[PDB]
Amino acid sequence: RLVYYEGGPVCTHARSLWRLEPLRISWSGSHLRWGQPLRIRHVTTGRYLGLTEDQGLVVVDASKAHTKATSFCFRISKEKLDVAPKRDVEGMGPPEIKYGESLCFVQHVASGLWLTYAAPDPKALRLGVLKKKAMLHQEGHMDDALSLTRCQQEESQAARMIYSTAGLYNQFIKGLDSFSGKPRGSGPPAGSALPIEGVILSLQDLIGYFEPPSEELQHEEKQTKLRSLRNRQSLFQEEGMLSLVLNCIDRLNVYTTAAHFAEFAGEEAAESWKEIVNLLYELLASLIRGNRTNCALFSTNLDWLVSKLDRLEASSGILEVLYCVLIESPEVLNIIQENHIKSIISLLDKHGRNHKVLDVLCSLCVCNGVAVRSNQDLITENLLPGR
Amino acid sequence: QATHLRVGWALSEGYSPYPGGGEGWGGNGVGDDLYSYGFDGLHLWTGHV
Amino acid sequence: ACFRMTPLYNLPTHRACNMFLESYKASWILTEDHSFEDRMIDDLSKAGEQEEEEEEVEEKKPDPLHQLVLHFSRTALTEKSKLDEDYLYMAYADIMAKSCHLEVEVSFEEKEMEKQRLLYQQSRLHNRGAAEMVLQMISACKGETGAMVSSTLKLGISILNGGNAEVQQKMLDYLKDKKEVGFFQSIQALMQTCSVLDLNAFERQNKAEGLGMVNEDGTVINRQNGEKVMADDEFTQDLFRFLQLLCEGHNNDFQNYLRTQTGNTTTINIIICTVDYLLRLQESISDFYWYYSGKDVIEEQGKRNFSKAMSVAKQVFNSLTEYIQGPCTGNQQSLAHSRLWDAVVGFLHVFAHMMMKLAQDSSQIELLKEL
Amino acid sequence: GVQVETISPGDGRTFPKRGQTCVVHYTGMLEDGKKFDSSRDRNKPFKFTLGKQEVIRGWEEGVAQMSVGQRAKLIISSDYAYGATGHPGIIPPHATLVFDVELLKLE
Amino acid sequence: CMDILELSERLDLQRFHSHTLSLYRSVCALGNNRVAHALCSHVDQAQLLHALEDARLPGPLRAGYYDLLISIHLESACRSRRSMLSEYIVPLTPETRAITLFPPGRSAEDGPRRHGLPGVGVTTSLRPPHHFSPPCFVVALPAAGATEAPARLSPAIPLEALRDKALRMLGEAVRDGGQHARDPVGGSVEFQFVPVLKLVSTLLVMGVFSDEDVKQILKMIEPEVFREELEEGLLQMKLPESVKLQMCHLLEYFCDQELQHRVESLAAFAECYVDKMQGNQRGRYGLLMKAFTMSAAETARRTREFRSPPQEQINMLLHFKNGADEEECPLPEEIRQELVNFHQDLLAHCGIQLEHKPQSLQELVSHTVVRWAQEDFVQSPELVRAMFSLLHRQYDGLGELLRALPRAYTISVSSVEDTMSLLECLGQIRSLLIVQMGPQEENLMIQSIGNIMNNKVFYQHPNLMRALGMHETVMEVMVNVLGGGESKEIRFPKMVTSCCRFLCYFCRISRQNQRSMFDHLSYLLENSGIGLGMQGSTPLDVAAASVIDNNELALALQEQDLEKVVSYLAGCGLQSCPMLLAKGYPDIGWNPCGGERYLDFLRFAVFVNGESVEENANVVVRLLIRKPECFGPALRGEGGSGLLAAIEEAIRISEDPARDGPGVPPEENRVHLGHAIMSFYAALIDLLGRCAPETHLIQAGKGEALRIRAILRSLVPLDDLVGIISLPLQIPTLGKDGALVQPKMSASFVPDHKASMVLFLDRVYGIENQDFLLHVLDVGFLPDMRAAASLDTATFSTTEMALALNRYLCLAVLPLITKC
DSSP: OOOEEOOSGGGGSGGGOEEEEESOSTTTTSOOOTTOOEEEEETTTOOEEEEETTTEEEEEOGGGOOHHHHOEEEESSOOSOTTSOOOOOSSSOOOOOOSSSOEEEEEETTTOOEEEEOOOOTTHHHHTOOOEEEEEESSOOTTOOEEOOOOOHHHHHHHHHHHHHHHHHHHHHHHHHHTTTOOOTTSOOOSOOOOHHHHHHHHHHHHHHTOOOOSSSOHHHHHHHHHHHHHHHHHHHHHTHHHHHHHHHHHHHTSSSHHHHHHHHOHHHHTTHHHHHHHHHHHHHHHHTTOHHHHHGGGSSHHHHHTTTTOSSSHHHHHHHHHHHHHHOHHHHTTOOHHHHHHHHHHHHHHOOOHHHHHHHTTSSEETTEEOHHHHHHHHHHHSTTO | OOOOOOEEEEOTTTOOOOSSOOSTTSOOOTTSSTTEEEEOSSOEEOTTO | OTTTOOOGGGSOHHHHHHHHHHHHIIIIITTOOOOOHHHHHHHHTOOOSHHHHTOOSSSOOOOHHHHHHHHHHHHHHSOOSSOOOOHHHHHHHHHHHHHSOOOOOOOHHHHHHHHHHHHHHHHHHHTTTHHHHHHHHHHHHTTOOSHHHHHHHHHHHHHHTTTOHHHHHHHHHHHHHHOOTHHHHHHHHHHHHOOOOOHHHHHHHHHHHHSOOOSOTTTSOTTOOOOSSSTTHHHHHHHHHHHHHHHTTTOHHHHHHHHOOTTSSSOOOHHHHHHHHHHHHHHHHHHHHHHHHSSSSOOHHHHHHHHHHHHHHHHHHHHHHHHHTTTOHHHHHHHHTTTHHHHHHHHHHHHHHHHHHHTTOGGGHHHHHHO | OEEEEEEEOOOSSOOOOTTOEEEEEEEEEETTSOEEEEHHHHTSOEEEETTSSOBOHHHHHHHHTSOTTOEEEEEEOHHHHTTTTOBTTTBOSSOOEEEEEEEEEEO | OOOGGGGGTOHHHHHHHHHHHHHHHHHTTTTOHHHHHHHTTTSOHHHHHHHHHOSSSOHHHHHHHHHHHIIIIIHHHHHHHHHHTTOEEEEOSHHHHHOOSSOOOSSOSSOOSOOOOTTOSOOOOOOOOOOEEOOOSSBOOOOSOTTOSOOOOEEOOOHHHHHHHHHHHHHHHHHHHHHTOSSOGGGSHHHHHHHHHHHHHHHHHHTOOOHHHHHHHHHHHOTTTTOOOOOOOGGGSOOOHHHHHHHHHHHHHHHHHHHHHHHHHHHHHHHHHHHHHHHHHHHHHHHHHHSOOSOHHHHHHHHHHHTSOHHHHHHHHTOOTTOOOTTTOOOOHHHHHHHHHHHHHHHHHHTOOOOOSOOSHHHHHHHHHHHHHHHOOOOOHHHHHHHHHHHHHHHOHHHHHHHHGGGEEEEOGGGHHHHHHHHHHHHHHHHTTSBOOOHHHHHHHHHHHHHHHHSHHHHHOHHHHHHHTHHHHHHHHHHHHHHTTSSSOOSOHHHHHHHHHHHHHHHHHOHHHHHHHHTTHHHHHHHTTSOSTTOSOOHHHHHHHHHTTOHHHHHHOOHHHHHHHHHHHHHHHHSOOHHHHHHTOOOOSSOHHHHHHHHHHHHHHHEETTEEOHHHHHHHHHHHHHSGGGGTGGGOTTTOOOHHHHHHHHHHHHHSTTTSSOOOOTTSSSOOHHHHHHHHHHHHHHHHHHHSOOHHHHHHTOHHHHHHHHHHHHHSOHHHHHHHHHSOOOOOEEETTTEEEOOOGGGSOOHHHHHHHHHHIIIIIOOOOHHHHHHHIIIIIHHHHHHHHHTTSTTTTTOHHHHHHHHHIIIIIHHHHHHO
């Protein structure tokens, strides 16, 4: 709910993206003008910058974002010459503000306050905090001017997708928690309806979105597509879609089969349980594949993944996720243990002779030209001597 | 590998050891199935035991 | 000193052998001059038995030199966090750069013949992707100085020498078609890393030289540490020479592009970046003058550092002149509304006072002429 | 303990004594019949000195119980072969080993 | 069971088994010789040798079995040899003396166009042998501790038989390719040729092939070029790109052999020529001395040569390339002509000194590479890179020698055995660069470091050590373990402690070693943010060793590095130690122990050879004042209690438990907070005193020196220094009956703390007034002198406090009184 001036990697993430919304529908895409009132929307959360009588400067919900609270303007200078009003124009209007070049002060229209930074609170710089809370002040500072920087179409599309997908999956998780522990017996599911169709379509769309580039492509095109894919994976992970997918997987994993799920959600919902689980695992694999940063996140919760290898509904998908993690992350390789290796071998024992399991087995043996002697020894001692 | 040499009896319908692979580790002869009964000097061979 | 009398004939045979190997490599092998670059490029640029193979296909297969350039382009385009140092790329970039020679009264005919020879030598490379390769390598360096970017800049200068309009057109088309901010981001980072005169470094170097020779030269380090003041002056000159050659001949399109890249998501003003570097250099030179103003005569090392700084400043002035000449009115306005006037004021102060000071001792006539 | 079962007779008189170098050709199997070692695969007789604790205890006793030129089957219990630890990656824990040894010569 | 040849049609089983072979290769990859020995029980030598020859085996299985043989038996030896193949340590033996650039031939003994066959002849560069052990699974298992047993060797396989088999298979493959059958072994030409070529390349690099074998391989590659003074050669057959890649590997090996031969010929000539030069210089000296002084000036000018460093003498004696008179270069004309002839021969060998049939290795490689590139648009980037590397080496042969010489080195015959042992140890250390560190690897690294530091060649040939790059490899190992889990308490502390003991000594061996380590200062300072809990040597200690008592390096130091260290010190002055908090110490709010380490690195940079380096001292003082938290909570402007109050509070903390430590212990509670605080402030005062300017600068009245001294005087009051110097020390006493009540030196106020105060007082404030001298003597010095004198009894004479008092008096106090 709070707004900050922050620097560093955040300048490439989706939490620093804002949509400028003039107070009109017609010609809302016209050139922006000095002193023209407008709203500022946070893309990934859908909230609006505004002034609240209690909390000061915050981002409010759209339901509470009335013009008085959330109407701002851009000013060339802090002089008190805003008296001169202007009328709207039926057209693109005259170009006034430029990307990068123009330096603009943000003013709250109703109160006349200026968007500035709060006096840096002590002990925060001492700890190492380098973000300054933003506030609305009567005077401000001389360096209050902001520069407007353009973002790529891919970034803006990803931000809007994150917003809608987060909404949908949060609704799904709430639906599951609604009947978390309430058996239906023979009556109605005893909960809120689930967005099964929306979830399935969204998962398919995101799998296609994160599809890796085709191998039969010219090197240059493949490299550009790989760069775009990595950037999109990073954007989603930073906005926290990985945790959301894992939470959905947890809630659906509580149930051991479609019939067990139907005992709480109903037969109609249970008709899609297996499909949703498999799609979630495919999305997880697409989200982490080839991404060292995303894959390294499993070094803390490897048991979460290894303990699911013997689930029969999505065995191949779970194995694919594990394969991606081990292929990309040496950190996971350095925390693998004997029980993990034994579970992976029991996969061979219980599911049959699958070469992907061997591929996984010595994705543990070497990574990036460095060998893990403990993993090699454990595999040798637990797999070979039985013959 | 130790030389194989066994002597005994075999039943016409059923004793068909083909060259190459087979029961156990291959090299099937007299007493490597339940259709033949063999002796090798130290062991009585039948059923591949 | 004298009484110690350390003779070579007393050294053990193996110590003498190692010393001999070092000295022989330094004086005989290293000094040897072998010119194989032209022969190598000429051999590699030849297709073989094309008619016998019946290459009636409209798209002929690349010849060996083309394939080498394509391989290095692929290496540059590979998506990586950083560009790894590559001895092979550096060696072949040096070979390609040397292949374009850039060689009394010379007749108009002889001058034109030299120009045509250089154009042919440069076409040998830029007809096979060398210009795009240079741009890709500059972009891939991601603003990190080093041998890779030095070799890339030298190759670019070699293929651009004389204001090669065809190479300029190819570079501009590639940049405007790819629309990547990485190239100019890398250029800006390199320009910001470029160094100026440093008086603390100068005093440190003076003290290091002052440190005497007590033990024998082998045991001591001979205080032969590389130059501490403007150590990358060659790289700075190469960078600004490359930027100048991008505009040589009053290429209006590329002159405008250096100021604003309309198609990209963000733009960098290379003209203003150059002005900012010039301002830093002017301030450093003013500091040097103030350091030496009290002294009567500038010593040899001070003269050498002044000369290096002045060569860099000369190159920067030539780059700005190339940016604006033609005239590029947009660049003229961008410079007029910049910090150039302050740099010129500081330079005028330094010029006046250094003129008056250097005129008073004839041992500094060369420095005065350079000034 | 180790049990020795003759396969082919030896000379009957020449037995190894402590400090002698026995030269043997052997094939090792686990009790279930899985081969894990054989000197004949490497085509080189295995030499070991009796009494220097170079080989397992079962071997030390069984080969000493044999005569020159003799071939015998040695059945060795786990405590005599490798015990609980086993041979990591080769022999499982608590494994009984069956060997087919032949004492080629004594030196 | 079935025949394994049924996997040609049973494709699921074939895929599973090929991936099983890959898993076998991977569980033993990168030096796991123990697992290789284990795998010898699952795929035995007879199986591997039969698979090598099985012509009906499906291609993936054939390739897998060739790769499995290589991984089990040859990979480790090949890697270790390949690591050493880039260095040329030539012993000065008769074989080396015999080596010559060109083969002794009827045309000429040196000069003739015809080279010797590459890779054939005599080479003397030192290369440690291969070590293998026999596979055997009936031996008694070593029942000693784990991770301490000697590292397993690679399982052995008969190498002469393997060589013969590889050669025969390669010959058969060449013949079959020439015949162009429709059933290639393995199902394709690539599957027929790539495995055998990989095996041959591995054996070649291992260097097991004899001269006759190498001649056979050369004739298989090119019958006409490498004829000895069928007709289709591999290089002239039409082959896939992978086969071309293996051919490139073979050509690379032979080009490397040519380079090695050039290096060794140069070394042999160097031996002979240097002997001649020394012998001539001896005669010249004898004749010069024998001269009855024609002219004293002439004698001095002549002896100017002989009173010069030997390297400079050699440079002068070799300066006749473009002619020189007997005064510029006294070397005789015959001796000059010898070098001229050898230089011509070397240029001719490299091809610099100047038929469609190649007739030479260089021309063969150039023609082959250019022809391949002309014939096809090569699709494999690895093949392209190998092709153009080979072509560059062929075209620039003198440059290859120039870039290789830095790694060449001649040694005496008496150093060969120790050099071989050192090379084995360095090989083990280098092998540890591709494996995650564990207990066994840690033990191996420590043992190798100990052996190297006990080897004589380590000390006598620091230039050889630098050429081998020992310091860089050890640094890389140390930094790998440090960075791995940087936030987590780093594991294997003993290995890092050894990582100095080695490197932190390597710096001290020689000045060039010190410079080489100094070149990595930022790296060490980057990784020095962690430590302390080391309780041993650290990368910060490596950094100090690089700049210690070296004026040139201290002047070459960088303001960026000093700012990095000062930032670490600020962090230590603002935050408590997480490790101490975990161990249960009170939270005092800062980190005196780390602050002390950082102050210590700064002290070495500021003061060199008993004098302050003004350039570094001013920078350090300015950084410290710009970050006041670096002075500790006592010297804070607002809430500061002052230095004297800080020391007194530290004494009270030491006296009171439950504030000095956890109060719950290997080194008697490890850290004591009171002593830590006192030590931090002592180190800070020592650093400031050492940053104080010199008396000659003060006398000359330099503005900067005066300003710096004024700043230091403002930081530290004189009354606080006198008070600390006057604080009483706890002296050993005899209580009860024979009870020596000795103070715990590591937990109390010690004279080492007063020594820093004395240094600061003498360097910054200085004693110049008789009244002040008498006052300080009466209050601070005389009581300590009397205590030290009274502790001279036989019982107390050797107590820790008595020895500390003696050191304090003889290093700080008495010199000052002598000066005053």
